[PDB]
Design a protein around this ligand. Structure first.
Ligand SMILES: c1ccc2[nH]ccc2c1
Lengths: 104, 105
């Protein structure tokens, strides 16, 4: 899913530079598919990548529903980190939680 | 080697904060000095991130300026890796950790 996540990041940047919201629509379709695979495989690193792009979207638009989705995925990430006993992923999750709130 | 030492450093900071024994913070910073140098040579961004996370924890519990100075030096090294690799996700994780450093008292 490396190709899709990098393309999604690219489209988020192009959408903000051009104002073409159809590109943000496409980016979000890519992000949904990556999120679905991350959640189905319990992959915290993929989730972190999705969350990072969602935060970018929230900075650019202030969309509360995108913020809500990012918070949803952060809870899922913290669940995986606690399940696996990885305190560092847990701390990253908390550092990203701060970034969501400051982006609103 | 490095991962074990990192886990021990994190453990010692938790033990220091649990007991109030600041000599364990000292030992953790010693371990982190050694690992920070190893992880910089490995080029492994995860290991750098783990070390920075523990340094942030120590700054909050002690305020030690030299600990914060090391965290900033490693955040610079982490950003160089991100640039070299074209990895915007490492860049974003570095920025998120830098916000935490800049908000310590
Ligand atoms: C991001 C942050 C911390 C981490 N610890 C192990 C993997 C990993 C990824």
């Amino acid at each position: 899913m490396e190709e899709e996540i990098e393309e999604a990041y690219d489209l988020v940047e192009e959408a903000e530079k051009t104002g073409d919201t159809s590109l943000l629509k496409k980016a979000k379709e890519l992000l949904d598919k990556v999120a679905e695979e991350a959640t189905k495989s319990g992959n915290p690193i993929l989730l972190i990548r999705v969350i990072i792009i969602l935060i970018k979207i929230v900075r650019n638009s202030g969309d509360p529903s995108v913020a809500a989705l990012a918070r949803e995925l952060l809870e899922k990430l913290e669940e995986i980190a606690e399940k696996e006993g990885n305190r560092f992923i847990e701390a990253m999750g908390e550092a990203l939680r701060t970034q969501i709130e400051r982006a609103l």
